[PDB]
Amino acid sequence: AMSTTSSVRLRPLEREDLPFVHQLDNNASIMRYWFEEPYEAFVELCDLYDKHIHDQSERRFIIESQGTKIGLVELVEINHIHRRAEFQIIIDPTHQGKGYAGAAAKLAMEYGFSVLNLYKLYLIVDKENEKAIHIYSKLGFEIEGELKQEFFINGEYRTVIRMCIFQPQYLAKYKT
Amino acid sequence: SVRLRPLEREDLPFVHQLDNNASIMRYWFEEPYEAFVELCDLYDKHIHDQSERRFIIESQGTKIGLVELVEINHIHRRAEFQIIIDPTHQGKGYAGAAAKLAMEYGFSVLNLYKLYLIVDKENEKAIHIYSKLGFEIEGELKQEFFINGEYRTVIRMCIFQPQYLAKYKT
Amino acid sequence: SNAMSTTSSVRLRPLEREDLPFVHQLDNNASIMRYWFEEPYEAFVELCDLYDKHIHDQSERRFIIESQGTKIGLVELVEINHIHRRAEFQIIIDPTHQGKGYAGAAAKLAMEYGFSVLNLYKLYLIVDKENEKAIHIYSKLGFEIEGELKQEFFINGEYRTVIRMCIFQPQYLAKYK
Amino acid sequence: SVRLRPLEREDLPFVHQLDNNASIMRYWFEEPYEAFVELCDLYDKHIHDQSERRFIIESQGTKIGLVELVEINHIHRRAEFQIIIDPTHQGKGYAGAAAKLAMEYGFSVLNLYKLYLIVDKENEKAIHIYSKLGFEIEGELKQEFFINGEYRTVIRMCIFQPQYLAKYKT
Amino acid sequence: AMSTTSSVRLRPLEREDLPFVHQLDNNASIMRYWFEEPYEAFVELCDLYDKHIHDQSERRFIIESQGTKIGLVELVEINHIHRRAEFQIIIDPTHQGKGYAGAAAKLAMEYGFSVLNLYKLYLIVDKENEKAIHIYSKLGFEIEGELKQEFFINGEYRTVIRMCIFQPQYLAKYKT
Amino acid sequence: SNAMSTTSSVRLRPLEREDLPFVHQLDNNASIMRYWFEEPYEAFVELCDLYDKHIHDQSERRFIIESQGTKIGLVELVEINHIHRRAEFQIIIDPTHQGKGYAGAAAKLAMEYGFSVLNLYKLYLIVDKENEKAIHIYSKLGFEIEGELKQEFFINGEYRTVIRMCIFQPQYLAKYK
Ligand SMILES: [Ca+2]
Ligand SMILES: [Ca+2]
Ligand SMILES: [Ca+2]
Ligand SMILES: [Ca+2]
Ligand SMILES: [Ca+2]
Ligand SMILES: [Ca+2]
């Protein structure tokens, strides 16, 4: 009743959302991928979007609150035989610090487990991203790996933490 | 005399029979196949795709096995590799020798920084071989594969280019 | 099973293009409508073109049943859905190999593939209600009747009623593992 | 406030007017063009080609110039770059600043080992700027370009990733 | 009359020559290119060959003597406005040490200057390839550059020497 | 040329798609056969399709002649061959701008582009033998007569004879550089 992340919801990403997606990081400071294919330019993103519209190996959702676009959920590496996927939550910089990361993570978990019928969801975060690690630990994720020097970013190799959670634990804890 | 050469179309029957038992899902450039004809069509579709690279392991003119480099990324300068030895040649120390050839190609030809591999946690022998070659354990991926009716846990191991080039490239 | 056992050499292998003549002659009599990935065919040439068009389609999967290198029959998994985690299967035995218990053995192999390789939750099949012997075989393998689809198929001049039977992943993995 | 952003289709008129005088042969992914319409068609044909990458240099929302990385090779881990400053913004020290942004992108984002550039041997000012940034002369390519009726000689200068990351990335 | 490099000639590369080309170095020990596109497998070479059959930016010739294939001449980076090209001579290992490198170099120079009407031909060779440097110096090439750590080969960066010769000097010295 | 000079503001710029209506109206009279990359056209729509098909063809190059932002005419370099290092050119002045000496000025610009940008060795042109004024202009610019092509064009009911004139790169670069 009295909270600020009460209007937070997911909806399917549309073509018209691409300008919002693109501006999440159009700085020539990182390599960005769409269905595992690199892009920088908006026009390149649009062409990749069109080429993969029926590809089920990734799925994306806009995070919105009261009609404004706050971020993106991506599920990638989706495999329905092993029943797993990786996810990532991206919050627009202008909407950080309002608790939306945590709320969106629960929405992503709910979609992956209760709609897609996955067994395992996992995520990767920088080892120095202590806040995200804390959020995911509190939601029930466990650390399964420390991938050493896995990404070259801004001139240095960074180490990431892989965390996972499983469908039985999720459905028990949040669908009791 | 163990060596690598590039995989060719005519090698596909050898590749396919490494496991044509309807007992596992197999992938080619991340696309599933079971039938030989399905593999052949996927092979044709990805002939210029640089995100994976494959090599036949041979000794004295016989085909011993396959090396696959997959998830190749030249910005992050890494790749996953897998060594598959034909069952009829598993007794002869080719796993270790092939692993060194894969390392040599990835580090000294492709100019990668990081090579990693995945092995079943119960595969103690392979884990030991890779530890002896200098690989370190970076993760234990829990229930990562559904195989033959159960979820299996795998070990991810990695090694880096400077350590390799120092130890084997003076 | 050890030295002193009866074991069958019946196995499944993935259907290949070169198997299509065997598939086609299982019933080339102009007596039934035949489908490949839900598209009708009669002529061998039509089957071949449909085969080519659906080579990478994951909604159906087929296997040749073989024993001692002879082709005995076909297993089809159709209507595969990995979100609801189910599929329908059918076992078709060549007429020249019927009456030797290959239907039952093939069914176990199909169950094993669907549950232990494909990671499905539910497998089901349809059989004619008058086919008491097949119903009994499937009951003995652990299938339960879930419904009776009335006049669901027009076959040889009359509407036939079929029985839908199913089995689930936990019961299977427990009982055969 | 000088920055890079990825080149877009809508930037092509700006690119084209940097030299639309019928006075030089210009190339896009190594294919010649003169007319704007020809550039636009080449742009469309190469939108996913990773062998070149381009960026608009901007300051305070105005378009100042273009950075091009060409001949990109991720096995040898090198690329050529060129900085082109609009004539109306040449007086303001943007050449040097843009060069540092190009270096930063090539070394700290793309993970290249070697960046090099070509400049006319008579362009003493540019040579001085690049020398001050740490580039060393590696060659003098004699009569390498026919321009305005005569063969011109150019200087090739290069710099490497370890020196860069040490000096500007601590 | 009495010499061994008297039957040496060039002819245009044909599709049927691709197996000979491929085996010049099918060891998974170097990255190979065809019209600047990478390949390893023979099938990949064949597809690239087909795609570039009318591309004039490169031209290749088989070096033969008495009907046997001894090597390959490649002219690449051909530009007819600047009137230049790079060339390379590759001698099959089983035919090295019979003076064919030098003879083939003269054939390549003759084609580039007297048929293609180029102004400048240049080549790159490893700095430690003292024999090739000597051959090219004796033919009239001058050193124009030392490209530092230009190729990663077999685990190390190698430095190459760029050498060039011009059409007037050539036509004077060998067409007097 | 310095403060106190007569200089022309005549320039060349690369032909664009949007220039095609100007090109087409230079001679849309059903009085002559017109070619684009050696393919015939009459209709504007046909020209546009030919333009699109040859956008990256390097065997011809065209430029609009302009003065003070008005379109005056067209320069065409055709039959370009970079091995023999030659091309043919033609200067076409819009009828409403003829008689003001733009032909001569445009010819110098075309010579400069062909020799100093394209690196050609030989430029040549064809002119009607009865066109004494154009012959004189080209003679004054340094062209020499190399041949007289007899009854080479059927035009307006009769075979016409033309004069081929040429100039070479060394003579040009010496005399205007
Ligand atoms: Ca993937
Ligand atoms: Ca991947
Ligand atoms: Ca269906
Ligand atoms: Ca190139
Ligand atoms: Ca090139
Ligand atoms: Ca012609």
Automatic annotation (TrEMBL), chains A, E:
Keywords in alphabetical order: Acyltransferase, Calcium, Cytoplasm, Magnesium, Metal-binding, Transferase
InterPro entries reported for this sequence: Acyl_CoA_acyltransferase, GNAT_dom
Lineage: Bacteria, Pseudomonadati, Pseudomonadota, Gammaproteobacteria, Enterobacterales
MF GO annotations: diamine N-acetyltransferase activity; magnesium ion binding
Pfam families recorded: Acetyltransf_3
Recorded catalytic activity of this chain's protein: an alkane-alpha,omega-diamine + acetyl-CoA = an N-acetylalkane-alpha,omega-diamine + CoA + H(+); spermine + acetyl-CoA = N(1)-acetylspermine + CoA + H(+); spermidine + acetyl-CoA = N(1)-acetylspermidine + CoA + H(+); spermidine + acetyl-CoA = N(8)-acetylspermidine + CoA + H(+)
Pathway connected to this protein: Amine and polyamine degradation; spermine degradation; Amine and polyamine degradation; spermidine degradation
E.C. number: 2.3.1.57
Compartments it resides in: Cytoplasm
Organism (species): Yersinia pestis
PANTHER family: SPERMIDINE N(1)-ACETYLTRANSFERASE
Binding-site residues, Ca(2+): 36, 77
UniProt KW Repeat keyword: no
Main subcellular localisation: cytoplasm
Enzyme class, spelled out: transferase
Keyword Flavoprotein attributed: no
Name of this protein: Spermidine N(1)-acetyltransferase
Family: Belongs to the acetyltransferase family.
Domain N-acetyltransferase positions: 8-168
PROSITE patterns for this protein: GNAT
GO cellular component, one term: cytoplasm
